[PDB]
Amino acid sequence: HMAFDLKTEDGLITYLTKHLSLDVDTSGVKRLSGGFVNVTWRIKLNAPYQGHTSIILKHAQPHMSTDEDFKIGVERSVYEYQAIKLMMANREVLGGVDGIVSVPEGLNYDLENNALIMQDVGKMKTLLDYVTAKPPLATDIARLVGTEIGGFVARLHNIGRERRDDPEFKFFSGNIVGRTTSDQLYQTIIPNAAKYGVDDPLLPTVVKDLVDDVMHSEETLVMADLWSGNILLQLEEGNPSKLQKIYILDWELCKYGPASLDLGYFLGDCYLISRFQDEQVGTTMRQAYLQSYARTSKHSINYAKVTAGIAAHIVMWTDFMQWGSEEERINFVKKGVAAFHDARGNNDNGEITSTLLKESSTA
Ligand SMILES: [Cl-]
Ligand SMILES: [Cl-]
Ligand SMILES: [Cl-]
């Protein structure tokens, strides 16, 4: 077994040709990222590999971090890689009848040389990019995105209940690193309020409940990072008016947890878009999602828990996104903190809960 140098272009082509037998363009290679630990290469092949002529390779360098940090990084990789393999295997029952939602295929993961190979998607723009541009994303396209992601996420949650005990599914229940990241995120709720003048003494309790659910729930399988910054859109190469594919990119946090976590992320992000970008794009998208999610899911939504999930997203993300002005952001977070009182009080005239019911109505 040879030691290879994946930090140089020449060592890259040795690894690809000598170890994996790939026919590599010596001039189809470009570095994308690179610090002390990680490197990302974009690569063009002269002959296909698992159907693909272009791929990316990521590489962690050992001995450039503590032993503890390097170990957790590898764990994150494996869950990301294995999550993507699970969706490739369940492509048929998830990607639906005529559906366009998909995951960038994972091709190879070499734990000996710390080298992961994935499908190269292209230089596609995120959803987040399309909804912040002036002008914004056509509304016909926003409806379809909502309808497709709702149906994917519902099919995901359905299969995760019925295959809960199969061992490849239980593997993700054990993604403790992934559950801990969720926890750390929920801990910023009280700081982010405090910073904006809000200081409600309910928040301790609400945080406690969110943290326990995420550390202990085994309800279903959740994508766990379903916001617009982690979603790519492939538009027709020419007509900017026809959607071809939606890709969900980062699956590191995939795990067992409550269904409401996925609804909170995405509906939450819709609320942010409605308020600070385009009301019709954010609102179409929200409603389309709720419409298809409610038709496909084999369990009823819990409106209190989704209301609180949305509140959580609002308080955790308003500052990060850095939209509008200080003053407006303060009042938006205040509406979030208000929505926690509506969840705990089971109040169906609450501003958020009430909307949820209307937009997910059947007839
Ligand atoms: Cl390809
Ligand atoms: Cl396991
Ligand atoms: Cl702005």
Residue numbers in the entry: 0 to 362
Tell me, in the authors' exact words, what the paper reports.
Biosynthesis of psilocybin from the amino acid l‐tryptophan involves four strictly sequential modifications.
Here we present a crystallographic analysis and a structure‐based mutagenesis study of this kinase, providing insight into its mode of substrate recognition. The results of our work will support future bioengineering efforts aimed at generating variants of psilocybin with enhanced therapeutic properties.
